[PDB]
Design a protein around this ligand. Structure first.
Ligand SMILES: Nc1ncnc2c1ncn2[C@@H]1O[C@H](COP(=O)(O)OP(=O)(O)NP(=O)(O)O)[C@@H](O)[C@H]1O
Ligand SMILES: Nc1ncnc2c1ncn2[C@@H]1O[C@H](COP(=O)(O)OP(=O)(O)NP(=O)(O)O)[C@@H](O)[C@H]1O
Lengths: 158, 158
């Protein structure tokens, strides 16, 4: 029931206009989103992880320098589509939470895209399978991800 | 001639007993080794890289938080074989130089093993192919590496 309740919570962030009070493009901002989605569901909601984690043969940033990584990641520029995806890709590698990084950082991405390009990702039309592939490859090369997301943008941001 | 001269330079470090002045298990120590091996061969000899690099579908620690990562990596403990390989594995992910990380960090590893376990890796008997595989997998899981290196130790350290 967690996946369900976290979705309802995401549904509520926008419907309530609380999304508009989230800090855009910062670590603190990502933590806000995560806290709001998973508050009361995961007891680590909003908290940077202590432990190391890996998935599908990738290891995310070592917990021991995760906080330091995040300090630099949030400072990355958001001027162009390419720069925003670059930032998104790094924040993914950072993977600051034990769980729920995906939903939360996607929202995080959309807010950056909205602020700087007046656009958001039309996730309806994005294949979950292809997205996951693109992300898996992203650290070595973000071509697949850019190609996937660029023609799935929409300026219909509300 | 890089790879052969750098080899000659590695011979010297030991034959001259200069190896014994290298700081053991620290970032500075690794820089010393690199500087000794590649001094006058690479103009970045001994220097932490500013640029990002990747190999065989792995991307090494982002240049932007590489210095911070190193500060934490050098502090890792060296009491047991498992802990030493753990440290070695992290320093590999860090991959602080544009080139020459392999030769230099292996020497770095041997010094740590020597100090703490009174043993070194008998690289003669270590398959290059298998080592490279083990390393490639090491961030996700260091089993292959430990298995490879444990029964290739020698207490005949000089
Ligand atoms: N092998 C991989 N390499 C890099 N990134 C990955 C990999 N696998 C997954 N990811 C990213 O991390 C996210 C999954 O992280 P996780 O913290 O499990 O979020 P989640 O909400 O539990 N699952 P999901 O809703 O499917 O994203 C995915 O959406 C990808 O963006
Ligand atoms: N795909 C990979 N993923 C993780 N680590 C790797 C990968 N490929 C190589 N390595 C490690 O990085 C080392 C080589 O890094 P590099 O910067 O090329 O140094 P090098 O000294 O030029 N090569 P070598 O002399 O063979 O060790 C290898 O010895 C491995 O320990």
């Amino acid at each position: 029931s967690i996946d369900e309740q976290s979705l309802h919570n995401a549904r509520r962030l926008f419907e309530s206009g609380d999304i508009d009070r989230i800090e855009v493009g910062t670590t603190a901002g990502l933590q806000q989103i995560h806290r709001y989605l998973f508050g009361g569901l995961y007891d680590f909601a909003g908290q940077i992880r202590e432990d190391n984690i890996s998935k599908g043969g990738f290891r995310f940033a070592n917990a021991m320098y995760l906080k330091e990584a995040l300090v630099k990641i949030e400072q990355m520029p958001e001027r162009t589509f390419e720069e925003i995806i670059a930032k998104y890709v790094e924040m993914n590698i950072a993977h600051p939470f034990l769980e729920g990084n995906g939903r939360s950082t996607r929202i995080w991405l959309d807010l950056v895209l909205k602020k700087n390009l007046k656009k958001v990702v039309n996730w309806q039309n994005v294949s979950k399978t292809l997205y996951l592939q693109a992300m898996e490859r992203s650290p070595v090369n973000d071509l697949e991800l850019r190609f996937l997301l660029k023609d799935n943008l929409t300026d219909d941001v509300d």
